[PDB]
Scaffold this active site. Structure first.
Site, PDB file in Angstrom:
ATOM      1  N   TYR A  99       0.819  -1.209   0.000  1.00 36.19           N
ATOM      2  CA  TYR A  99       0.000   0.000   0.000  1.00 36.19           C
ATOM      3  C   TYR A  99       0.858   1.266   0.000  1.00 36.19           C
ATOM      4  CZ  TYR A  99      -3.564  -3.364   1.467  1.00 36.19           C
ATOM      5  OH  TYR A  99      -4.411  -4.445   1.545  1.00 36.19           O
ATOM      6  N   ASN A 120     -13.503  -3.295  -0.917  1.00 38.97           N
ATOM      7  CA  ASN A 120     -13.809  -2.877  -2.279  1.00 38.97           C
ATOM      8  C   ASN A 120     -15.121  -3.496  -2.761  1.00 38.97           C
ATOM      9  OD1 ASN A 120     -13.026  -5.523  -2.473  1.00 38.97           O
ATOM     10  ND2 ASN A 120     -11.207  -5.134  -3.729  1.00 38.97           N
ATOM     11  N   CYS A 128      -6.345  -5.561  -5.426  1.00 42.69           N
ATOM     12  CA  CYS A 128      -6.110  -5.601  -3.988  1.00 42.69           C
ATOM     13  C   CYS A 128      -5.094  -6.689  -3.654  1.00 42.69           C
ATOM     14  CB  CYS A 128      -7.420  -5.862  -3.242  1.00 42.69           C
ATOM     15  SG  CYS A 128      -8.168  -7.470  -3.596  1.00 42.69           S
ATOM     16  N   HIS A 129      -5.064  -7.732  -4.483  1.00 44.17           N
ATOM     17  CA  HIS A 129      -4.138  -8.840  -4.291  1.00 44.17           C
ATOM     18  C   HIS A 129      -2.699  -8.351  -4.406  1.00 44.17           C
ATOM     19  CE1 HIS A 129      -7.876 -10.018  -6.366  1.00 44.17           C
ATOM     20  NE2 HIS A 129      -7.894 -11.044  -5.535  1.00 44.17           N
ATOM     21  N   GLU A 154      -1.284 -16.056 -11.211  1.00 48.17           N
ATOM     22  CA  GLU A 154      -0.945 -14.957 -12.110  1.00 48.17           C
ATOM     23  C   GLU A 154       0.495 -15.075 -12.599  1.00 48.17           C
ATOM     24  OE1 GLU A 154      -1.923 -12.422  -8.582  1.00 48.17           O
ATOM     25  OE2 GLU A 154      -0.223 -11.241  -9.321  1.00 48.17           O
TER      26      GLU A 154
END
Length: 167
Positions: A99, A120, A128-129, A154
């Site tokens: 963040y 969210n 967010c991940h 991913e």
């Protein structure tokens, strides 16, 4: 708005041609009692077509931008979300940061941005991940196990375009 599929109850709710809130996994099979009026959402097409789409980007297999079939979201923010949203516009399946770097990038801090992507309205689209804490992994409302899987998924399976050179 309420719909059960595979192993998750998706709470898709919009004000027409623009989304606002559509999330939530499995929990109470008899959750249908938490709404004496809905319990439909028109499963016909409009639901099946979207369902497969949602699960698509989830298991890293949507390809392209994807920013469309998810329906345009409007309003809905837990003290903040606009800045973080600007994050998705850039980062995709392959980037991962906390963040601090994000908030500092705009004009805030990882404190306010936390509650942002945290609750969210659309978790199955917001990066967010790719926003963990100092150490590693930082979630309260849904995540950890899933955020873990999606984090490795991913990175794995790199999809590239076709080599089409026309000189």
């Amino acid at each position: 708005m309420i719909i059960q599929i595979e192993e998750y109850f998706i709470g898709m709710i919009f004000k027409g041609n623009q989304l606002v809130r559509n999330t939530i996994p499995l929990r109470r099979e008899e959750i249908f009692n938490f709404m004496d009026g809905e319990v439909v959402s028109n499963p016909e097409d409009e639901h099946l077509k979207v369902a497969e789409i949602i699960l698509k980007l989830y298991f890293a297999e949507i390809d392209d931008k994807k920013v469309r079939e998810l329906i345009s979201y409007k309003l809905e923010v837990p003290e903040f979300t606009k800045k973080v949203l600007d994050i998705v516009k850039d980062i995709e399946f392959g980037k991962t940061l906390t963040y601090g770097d994000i908030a500092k990038k705009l004009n805030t801090s990882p404190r306010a941005v936390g509650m942002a992507l945290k609750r969210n309205p659309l978790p199955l689209i917001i990066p967010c991940h790719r926003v963990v804490a100092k150490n590693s992994l930082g979630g309260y409302s849904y995540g950890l196990d899933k955020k873990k899987f999606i984090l490795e998924r991913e990175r794995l399976n790199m999809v590239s375009f076709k080599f089409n050179k026309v000189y």
